[PDB]
Amino acid sequence: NKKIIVMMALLHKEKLIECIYHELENGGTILLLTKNIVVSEISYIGNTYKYFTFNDNHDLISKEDLKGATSKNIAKMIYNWIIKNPQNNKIWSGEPRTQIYFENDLYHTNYNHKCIKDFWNVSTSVGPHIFNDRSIWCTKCTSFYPFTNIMSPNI
């Protein structure tokens, strides 16, 4: 049924916006990536959200005070960006840097299970880009939102 395919899309929307809303209200910062290149940033600085746009040389090319813009309205703007090009448009929520350690042909965060000991000292601080391919990540300590468009590990 077409009505069921529409209902499924509007439900996915409501759930992905709610996910983004909560991520923005918690971490206060989201990176927008197109083909695993950061193209924008929305960060709560002061008492407002600021929308930074970057060029291919990772130079700040724009800075916009979203002023009154709510977390929920920004979440909707971010979904509208994703759904236009869902195979290439992904978002990173939180501090860009993650401590990761390689062992037994898997990469580890130690988020959902302490796979690595003295992790804090044996780990390396690494940018978001490596999380684009979920296949290399340990399924015991590293979990992700069911949404393929959220690159950042859940917790």
Place this chain on the structure above:
Amino acid sequence: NKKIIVMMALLHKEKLIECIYHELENGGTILLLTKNIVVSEISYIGNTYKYFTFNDNHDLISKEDLKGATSKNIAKMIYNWIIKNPQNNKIWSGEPRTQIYFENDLYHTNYNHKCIKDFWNVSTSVGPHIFNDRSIWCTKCTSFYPFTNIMSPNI
């Protein structure tokens, strides 16, 4: 989010009505069971659907020509009956009798796989009630709709 819980319930409704609608348009007969006891029957006889209500002694106590009633409108009436008491109200679609055979601590229908040989002759014709507990059926030859309220095997 409450709106997501409501959207999920309306989507389950649309999917379960569409499932019932198709089952009615195919087999033309549905048994309504409450605690695995047949309490009603909707069957396409002639050019209309007829609604037979039974008592605990399986006696026809009523027969109602639904007249103009469409399969979609009847599917909706059957959903409204289910969702009132979803743990006890199930439906059987098609011929009440199914050929079943016991082997290797599993019951077989030979629907999705030829589990049994000379099945047609080694099998026994059996009412719907045994399909209430899905735990006892070969998962290779016997499949059910994801909807727990449709007792009858898919195909």
